[PDB]
Design a protein around this ligand. Structure first.
Ligand SMILES: Nc1nc2ccc(F)cc2s1
Lengths: 142, 142
């Protein structure tokens, strides 16, 4: 189902990175957040939901994800939370390692890695990148 | 017009700076309150945008944040041509901001609520969110 996303917090360089994956496509969005809090998580989720048609979000029982602020954002946006990507975290961290030297700050490196992940040609022919896939899948669904 | 073209501009509200991106072919928008009207903040926003959508060309005015070499380096890295609608989009967005404000103390949150309403709810029978995905998918498929 094209409305399903997984969200998770992972950790690198002593910082927190919130990762969202579109399950059907493998498309990713990620951002370094100042602290592993409900407030930061809710803002991230609200931005995500204004951009893609988000219906259900699967997370673990981490305190940021079970927070009242996240519950409120999901309620406002009409998102169903399921409690309850690890390979995605691994792939994202791998790409981060590949570009890390091209930025001073991890926050910039993370966005470079998202770009690379979503846009890189897969299987030796155009049209099968994560970013091309999510667009095709969502368009076909509507 | 080409599905890879976006316009970016800054607008102001309550003494804060709001960076706005419009996908020209669809009317879809992304916006965020940014800490300062700087090249660094603009470049970060643009890198995130470019990691999410296939951005080929960005139109802006000659504001110092848009002409900065940090924005230029981001465009180089991401393969984006800079060229030096949004007017009305700014007014539209501000109107919605007032309408969602009841669940948003901070303008930061309000802005994202308004983007959500603009892209998903307004149908003026497709939403801008449906249109962008259909325009881009059709481009990919051809
Ligand atoms: N490596 C790690 N860094 C942080 C930073 C914050 C936090 F809450 C948990 C962790 S685990």
């Amino acid at each position: 189902s094209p409305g399903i996303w997984q969200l998770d917090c992972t950790h690198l360089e002593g910082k927190v990175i919130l990762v969202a994956v579109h399950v059907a496509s493998g498309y990713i969005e990620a951002e370094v957040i100042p602290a592993e809090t409900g407030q930061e998580t809710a803002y991230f989720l609200l931005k995500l939901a204004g951009r893609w048609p988000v219906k259900t979000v699967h997370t673990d029982n981490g305190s940021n994800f079970t927070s009242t602020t996240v519950k409120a954002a999901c309620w406002w946006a009409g998102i169903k939370q399921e409690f309850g990507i690890e390979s995605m975290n691994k792939e994202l961290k791998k790409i981060i390692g590949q570009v890390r030297d091209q930025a001073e700050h991890l926050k910039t490196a993370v966005q470079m890695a998202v770009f690379i992940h979503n846009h890189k040609r897969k299987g030796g022919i155009g049209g099968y990148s994560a970013g091309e896939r999510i667009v095709d899948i969502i368009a076909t669904d509507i």
